[PDB]
Design an enzyme around this catalytic site. Structure first.
Site, PDB file in Angstrom:
ATOM      1  N   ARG A  85      12.757   9.832  -0.638  1.00  0.00           N
ATOM      2  CA  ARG A  85      13.060  10.536   0.611  1.00  0.00           C
ATOM      3  C   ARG A  85      14.053  11.678   0.358  1.00  0.00           C
ATOM      4  O   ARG A  85      14.840  11.632  -0.599  1.00  0.00           O
ATOM      5  CB  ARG A  85      13.624   9.577   1.666  1.00  0.00           C
ATOM      6  CG  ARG A  85      12.588   8.590   2.196  1.00  0.00           C
ATOM      7  CD  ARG A  85      13.110   7.735   3.337  1.00  0.00           C
ATOM      8  NE  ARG A  85      14.125   6.793   2.877  1.00  0.00           N
ATOM      9  CZ  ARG A  85      15.445   6.988   2.899  1.00  0.00           C
ATOM     10  NH1 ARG A  85      15.982   8.110   3.382  1.00  0.00           N
ATOM     11  NH2 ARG A  85      16.238   6.038   2.423  1.00  0.00           N
ATOM     12  N   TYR A 233       5.353  11.444  -1.637  1.00  0.00           N
ATOM     13  CA  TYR A 233       6.118  10.204  -1.781  1.00  0.00           C
ATOM     14  C   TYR A 233       6.097   9.428  -0.458  1.00  0.00           C
ATOM     15  O   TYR A 233       6.257  10.021   0.614  1.00  0.00           O
ATOM     16  CB  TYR A 233       7.579  10.456  -2.225  1.00  0.00           C
ATOM     17  CG  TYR A 233       8.430   9.210  -2.100  1.00  0.00           C
ATOM     18  CD1 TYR A 233       8.380   8.205  -3.074  1.00  0.00           C
ATOM     19  CD2 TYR A 233       9.235   8.996  -0.962  1.00  0.00           C
ATOM     20  CE1 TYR A 233       9.126   7.041  -2.941  1.00  0.00           C
ATOM     21  CE2 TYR A 233       9.986   7.826  -0.810  1.00  0.00           C
ATOM     22  CZ  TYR A 233       9.928   6.850  -1.801  1.00  0.00           C
ATOM     23  OH  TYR A 233      10.680   5.696  -1.659  1.00  0.00           O
ATOM     24  N   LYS A 242       8.583   4.925   7.993  1.00  0.00           N
ATOM     25  CA  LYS A 242       9.913   5.385   8.441  1.00  0.00           C
ATOM     26  C   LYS A 242       9.793   6.302   9.647  1.00  0.00           C
ATOM     27  O   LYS A 242      10.533   6.158  10.633  1.00  0.00           O
ATOM     28  CB  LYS A 242      10.638   6.135   7.315  1.00  0.00           C
ATOM     29  CG  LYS A 242      10.848   5.322   6.043  1.00  0.00           C
ATOM     30  CD  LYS A 242      11.432   3.957   6.335  1.00  0.00           C
ATOM     31  CE  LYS A 242      11.981   3.301   5.080  1.00  0.00           C
ATOM     32  NZ  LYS A 242      12.572   1.988   5.419  1.00  0.00           N
ATOM     33  N   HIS A 262      15.733  -1.384  10.760  1.00  0.00           N
ATOM     34  CA  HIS A 262      15.526  -1.405   9.328  1.00  0.00           C
ATOM     35  C   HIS A 262      15.917  -2.790   8.822  1.00  0.00           C
ATOM     36  O   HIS A 262      16.907  -2.953   8.083  1.00  0.00           O
ATOM     37  CB  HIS A 262      16.373  -0.291   8.717  1.00  0.00           C
ATOM     38  CG  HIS A 262      16.112  -0.035   7.275  1.00  0.00           C
ATOM     39  ND1 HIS A 262      17.048   0.560   6.456  1.00  0.00           N
ATOM     40  CD2 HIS A 262      15.031  -0.285   6.499  1.00  0.00           C
ATOM     41  CE1 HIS A 262      16.554   0.674   5.237  1.00  0.00           C
ATOM     42  NE2 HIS A 262      15.334   0.164   5.237  1.00  0.00           N
ATOM     43  N   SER A 284      18.756   1.076   2.286  1.00  0.00           N
ATOM     44  CA  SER A 284      17.680   1.229   1.323  1.00  0.00           C
ATOM     45  C   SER A 284      18.198   0.834  -0.054  1.00  0.00           C
ATOM     46  O   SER A 284      19.315   1.189  -0.440  1.00  0.00           O
ATOM     47  CB  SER A 284      17.156   2.666   1.304  1.00  0.00           C
ATOM     48  OG  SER A 284      17.010   3.176   2.616  1.00  0.00           O
ATOM     49  N   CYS A 286      19.211  -2.091  -1.092  1.00  0.00           N
ATOM     50  CA  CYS A 286      20.366  -3.008  -1.079  1.00  0.00           C
ATOM     51  C   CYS A 286      19.990  -4.484  -0.846  1.00  0.00           C
ATOM     52  O   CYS A 286      20.855  -5.304  -0.512  1.00  0.00           O
ATOM     53  CB  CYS A 286      21.414  -2.535  -0.072  1.00  0.00           C
ATOM     54  SG  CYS A 286      22.152  -0.939  -0.486  1.00  0.00           S
ATOM     55  N   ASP A 309      11.172  -5.005   5.634  1.00  0.00           N
ATOM     56  CA  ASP A 309      11.688  -3.631   5.810  1.00  0.00           C
ATOM     57  C   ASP A 309      11.901  -3.149   7.253  1.00  0.00           C
ATOM     58  O   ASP A 309      12.921  -2.533   7.558  1.00  0.00           O
ATOM     59  CB  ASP A 309      10.769  -2.645   5.059  1.00  0.00           C
ATOM     60  CG  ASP A 309      11.397  -1.276   4.883  1.00  0.00           C
ATOM     61  OD1 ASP A 309      12.454  -1.195   4.242  1.00  0.00           O
ATOM     62  OD2 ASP A 309      10.844  -0.272   5.379  1.00  0.00           O
ATOM     63  N   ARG A 403       8.009   2.279  -7.195  1.00  0.00           N
ATOM     64  CA  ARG A 403       7.637   1.339  -6.157  1.00  0.00           C
ATOM     65  C   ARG A 403       6.333   0.636  -6.458  1.00  0.00           C
ATOM     66  O   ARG A 403       5.484   1.164  -7.162  1.00  0.00           O
ATOM     67  CB  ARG A 403       7.481   2.086  -4.816  1.00  0.00           C
ATOM     68  CG  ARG A 403       8.740   2.761  -4.292  1.00  0.00           C
ATOM     69  CD  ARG A 403       9.476   1.914  -3.276  1.00  0.00           C
ATOM     70  NE  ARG A 403      10.786   2.475  -2.904  1.00  0.00           N
ATOM     71  CZ  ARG A 403      11.601   1.958  -1.983  1.00  0.00           C
ATOM     72  NH1 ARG A 403      11.247   0.883  -1.286  1.00  0.00           N
ATOM     73  NH2 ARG A 403      12.776   2.535  -1.740  1.00  0.00           N
TER      74      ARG A 403
HETATM   75  N1  LIG Z   1      22.977  -8.136  -7.846  1.00  0.00           N
HETATM   76  C1  LIG Z   1      22.013  -8.281  -6.902  1.00  0.00           C
HETATM   77  N2  LIG Z   1      21.016  -7.355  -6.853  1.00  0.00           N
HETATM   78  C2  LIG Z   1      20.029  -7.445  -5.926  1.00  0.00           C
HETATM   79  C3  LIG Z   1      20.053  -8.568  -4.973  1.00  0.00           C
HETATM   80  N3  LIG Z   1      18.978  -8.425  -4.177  1.00  0.00           N
HETATM   81  C4  LIG Z   1      18.325  -7.311  -4.590  1.00  0.00           C
HETATM   82  N4  LIG Z   1      18.948  -6.725  -5.633  1.00  0.00           N
HETATM   83  C5  LIG Z   1      18.505  -5.504  -6.355  1.00  0.00           C
HETATM   84  O1  LIG Z   1      18.624  -4.327  -5.559  1.00  0.00           O
HETATM   85  C6  LIG Z   1      17.491  -3.469  -5.753  1.00  0.00           C
HETATM   86  C7  LIG Z   1      16.824  -3.186  -4.412  1.00  0.00           C
HETATM   87  O2  LIG Z   1      16.504  -4.414  -3.776  1.00  0.00           O
HETATM   88  P1  LIG Z   1      15.372  -4.455  -2.645  1.00  0.00           P
HETATM   89  O3  LIG Z   1      15.278  -5.853  -2.079  1.00  0.00           O
HETATM   90  O4  LIG Z   1      14.161  -3.790  -3.256  1.00  0.00           O
HETATM   91  O5  LIG Z   1      16.094  -3.459  -1.584  1.00  0.00           O
HETATM   92  P2  LIG Z   1      15.433  -3.101  -0.152  1.00  0.00           P
HETATM   93  O6  LIG Z   1      16.538  -3.371   0.844  1.00  0.00           O
HETATM   94  O7  LIG Z   1      14.143  -3.861  -0.032  1.00  0.00           O
HETATM   95  O8  LIG Z   1      15.186  -1.500  -0.260  1.00  0.00           O
HETATM   96  P3  LIG Z   1      14.128  -0.571   0.591  1.00  0.00           P
HETATM   97  O9  LIG Z   1      12.778  -1.175   0.321  1.00  0.00           O
HETATM   98  O10 LIG Z   1      14.345   0.751  -0.096  1.00  0.00           O
HETATM   99  O11 LIG Z   1      14.529  -0.571   2.052  1.00  0.00           O
HETATM  100  C8  LIG Z   1      16.540  -4.155  -6.720  1.00  0.00           C
HETATM  101  O12 LIG Z   1      16.607  -3.569  -8.027  1.00  0.00           O
HETATM  102  C9  LIG Z   1      17.018  -5.595  -6.733  1.00  0.00           C
HETATM  103  O13 LIG Z   1      16.767  -6.254  -7.986  1.00  0.00           O
HETATM  104  C10 LIG Z   1      21.166  -9.539  -5.085  1.00  0.00           C
HETATM  105  O14 LIG Z   1      21.244 -10.527  -4.311  1.00  0.00           O
HETATM  106  N5  LIG Z   1      22.084  -9.333  -6.046  1.00  0.00           N
HETATM  107  O1  LIG Z   2      13.940   4.081   1.589  1.00  0.00           O
HETATM  108  C1  LIG Z   2      13.645   2.983   2.099  1.00  0.00           C
HETATM  109  O2  LIG Z   2      14.438   2.372   2.830  1.00  0.00           O
HETATM  110  C2  LIG Z   2      12.324   2.406   1.854  1.00  0.00           C
HETATM  111  O3  LIG Z   2      11.488   3.057   1.180  1.00  0.00           O
HETATM  112  O4  LIG Z   2      12.060   1.292   2.355  1.00  0.00           O
HETATM  113 MN   LIG Z   3      12.222  -3.164   0.339  1.00  0.00          MN
HETATM  114 MN   LIG Z   4      13.570   0.576   3.703  1.00  0.00          MN
END
Ligand SMILES: Nc1nc2c(ncn2[C@@H]2O[C@H](COP(=O)(O)OP(=O)(O)OP(=O)(O)O)[C@@H](O)[C@H]2O)c(=O)[nH]1
Ligand SMILES: O=C([O-])C(=O)[O-]
Ligand SMILES: [Mn+2]
Ligand SMILES: [Mn+2]
Ligand code: NA
EC number: 4.1.1.32
Length: 620
Positions: A85, A233, A242, A262, A284, A286, A309, A403
């Site tokens: 984004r 993307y 989004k 979100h 995002s 996190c 999401d 992704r």
């Molecule tokens: N240290 C740690 N890292 C984490 C944890 N949960 C997720 N991660 C890492 O953070 C990154 C993003 O995690 P996602 O669950 O994909 O984040 P998301 O909130 O789904 O992100 P979007 O899809 O962009 O909204 C990944 O590389 C994970 O491995 C956790 O509990 N601890």
């Molecule tokens: O950017 C973000 O939050 C996503 O792609 O879910």
């Molecule tokens: Mn996600």
């Molecule tokens: Mn997201």
């Protein structure tokens, strides 16, 4: 009804029929056909055969590669200029700026970007006329939410990207049945172009049509239009996600009495089979996807995924907060995903899955940082940049925001009510982000009003999900900074108004921090499946267990209330320590942000909660 042929692009239709369309869908298609001048119009039916043929066609042209190691999986590599984004090229058009964002005292808003109608029309005319020359315009009918849910909403996306068509089939309910369900109803109008009419002016990098210079992702809520130019993307081009399901929908939600957030949605079941649904807003990248389909380490506990999401939530006449997942798939961050961190994701993405900007092994598999799977000697790796890669090199094999795009139905712990038209009853809402210092593992808000303040106060380390570089702790209220469809102050008022609703059962609000680090930058909490231990505490608090100690920031677990069996090396005092110094600074910074960024639109109740927090901290 015409002196020549009219605006009839019937001659150029290569699948479906313009006569078969609802009248308003037809007008939308033909009007933009006249503007964009595509060679052909393909009305998507969403069938397996359409999908398979389109994928093979993309394969022919070198737009994607088949991953031979898996059952029907595909890899796209993008232009390195089109990888995430871009919040600074993402705009909302309204008559008054203040309806879109509060007017910041300091002059620059951190809460969205407004563009006047007049400026947008000029931007639009500099981009779209003739933009699809030599290409197919795909007409994608899609439903956000299960077909025939009362909470579901239909859109039509026009695009010149087969990649977008394929990805929308996974991420939404797409095809002929959506058109039939739509009838003469209203639909969100979604227009997308990669912005590279043929013949090409510049050469393509990596066979990836895009236009970074003219990239603009626009939302016109008063016209019920989304208009996105120049980026392929997903966040910028999968307009249901989004753009519609957060930005447009958040404002509709405000007007109609519901919420578009979100947030992941998950079901958590204790060892005696008692079940609850929780929603969680993290910024995002996190941790939402890892939480939503977590494999809990605590024996007896079960986690089931509703969505990872976006959540659409509405209080029913009984006062339960009902959530649906409006998506049909997971568009998840690849790096870090392993059997250890996210076993359920690994099983989901085995088949029928499109990968974008990950690395490819010589035996036709996928690779990325933190995959935690050794390769046999002799197996080589092609990076996301289409070059040979070694673990020697100081450059990742996969892009940091690479992704997977995978069907939600394949998740081995997909919740049985994940498509229930009525939604799932939410009993807890969790906020959280990446805070290396100061914020304990978990705390619970004191009231709805304090809970809303906690959402408003969220801060989190920058990630690779957008353009923001480095590790600066940015402000991300409700994990919605990039996604508010309207004035953030009014959004807070809308949240607070839920307390005054007919018989509403307000969920308990929590704030978590998985990412607290020690002196050496080592995570104090192992996270992933171990976060089940935090969810156990939340579960018991919703049940009304006396497992909480009051602190200035809210309730924390009593000593020994957290199950830490199997984690005796975790430093509990450091992980749960609340510093007067840190929190004095924290509140001062929240004060200044809200005053600057929200000012006259800041609800009294939020300012009041700020004043209360400040007072509680002063008494430490
Ligand atoms: N240290 C740690 N890292 C984490 C944890 N949960 C997720 N991660 C890492 O953070 C990154 C993003 O995690 P996602 O669950 O994909 O984040 P998301 O909130 O789904 O992100 P979007 O899809 O962009 O909204 C990944 O590389 C994970 O491995 C956790 O509990 N601890
Ligand atoms: O950017 C973000 O939050 C996503 O792609 O879910
Ligand atoms: Mn996600
Ligand atoms: Mn997201
Ligand atoms: Na490519």
């Amino acid at each position: 009804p015409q002196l020549h042929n009219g605006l009839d692009f019937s001659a150029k239709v290569i699948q479906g029929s313009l006569d078969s369309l609802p009248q308003e869908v037809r007008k939308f298609v033909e009007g933009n056909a006249q503007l964009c001048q595509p060679e052909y119009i393909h009305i998507c039916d969403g069938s397996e055969e359409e999908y398979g043929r389109l994928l093979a066609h993309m394969q022919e042209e070198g737009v994607i590669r088949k991953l031979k190691k898996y059952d029907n999986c595909w890899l796209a590599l993008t232009d390195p200029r089109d990888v995430a984004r871009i919040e600074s090229k993402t705009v909302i058009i309204t008559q008054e700026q203040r309806d879109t964002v509060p007017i910041p005292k300091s002059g620059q808003s951190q809460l969205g970007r407004w563009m006047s109608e007049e400026d947008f029309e000029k931007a639009f005319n500099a981009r779209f006329p003739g933009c699809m020359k030599g290409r197919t315009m795909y007409v994608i009918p899609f439903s956000m939410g299960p077909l025939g849910s009362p909470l579901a909403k239909i859109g039509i996306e026009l695009t010149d990207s087969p990649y977008v068509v394929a990805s929308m089939r996974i991420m939404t309910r797409m095809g002929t049945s959506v058109l039939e369900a739509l009838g003469d109803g209203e639909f969100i109008k979604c227009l997308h172009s990669v912005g590279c009419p043929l013949p090409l002016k510049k050469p393509l990098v990596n066979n990836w049509a895009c236009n970074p210079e003219l990239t603009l992702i626009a939302h016109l809520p008063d016209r019920r239009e989304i208009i996105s130019f120049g980026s392929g993307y997903g966040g910028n081009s999968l307009l249901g996600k989004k753009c519609f399901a957060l930005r447009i929908a958040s404002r509709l939600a405000k007007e109609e009495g519901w919420l578009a957030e979100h947030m992941l949605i998950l079901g958590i079941t204790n060892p005696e089979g008692k079940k609850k649904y929780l929603a969680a807003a993290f910024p995002s990248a996190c941790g939402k996807t890892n939480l939503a389909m977590m494999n809990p380490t605590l024996p007896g506990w079960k986690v089931e995924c509703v969505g990872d999401d976006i959540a659409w939530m509405k209080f029913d006449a009984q006062g339960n907060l009902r959530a649906i997942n409006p998506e049909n798939g997971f568009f998840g961050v690849a790096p870090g995903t392993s059997v250890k961190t996210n076993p359920n994701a690994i099983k989901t993405i085995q088949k029928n899955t499109i990968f974008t900007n990950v690395a490819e092994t010589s035996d036709g598999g996928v690779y990325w940082e933190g995959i935690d799977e050794p390769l046999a000697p002799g197996v080589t790796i092609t990076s996301w940049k289409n070059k040979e890669w070694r673990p020697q090199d100081e450059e990742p094999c996969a892009h940091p925001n690479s992704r997977f795009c995978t069907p939600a139905s394949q998740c081995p712990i997909i919740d049985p009510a994940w498509e229930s038209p009525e939604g799932v009853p939410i009993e807890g809402i969790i906020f959280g982000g990446r805070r290396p210092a100061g914020v304990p593992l978990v705390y619970e808000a004191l009231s709805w009003q304090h809970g809303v303040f906690v959402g408003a106060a969220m801060r989190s380390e920058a990630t690779a999900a957008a353009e923001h570089k480095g590790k600066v702790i940015m402000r991300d209220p409700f994990a919605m900074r990039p996604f508010f469809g309207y004035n953030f102050g009014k959004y807070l008022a809308h949240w607070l108004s839920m307390a005054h609703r007919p018989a509403a059962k307000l969920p308990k609000i929590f704030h978590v921090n998985w990412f607290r680090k020690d002196k050496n930058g080592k995570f104090l909490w192992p996270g992933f499946g171990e976060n089940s231990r935090v969810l156990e505490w939340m579960f018991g608090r919703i049940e009304g267990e006396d497992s909480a100690k009051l602190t200035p920031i809210g309730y924390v677990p009593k000593e020994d209330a957290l199950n830490l069996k199997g984690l005796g090396d975790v430093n509990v005092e450091e992980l749960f320590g609340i510093s007067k110094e840190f929190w004095e600074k924290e509140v001062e910074e929240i004060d200044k942000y809200l005053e600057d960024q929200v000012n006259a639109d800041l609800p009294y109740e939020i300012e009041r909660e700020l004043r209360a927090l400040k007072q509680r901290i002063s008494q430490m």
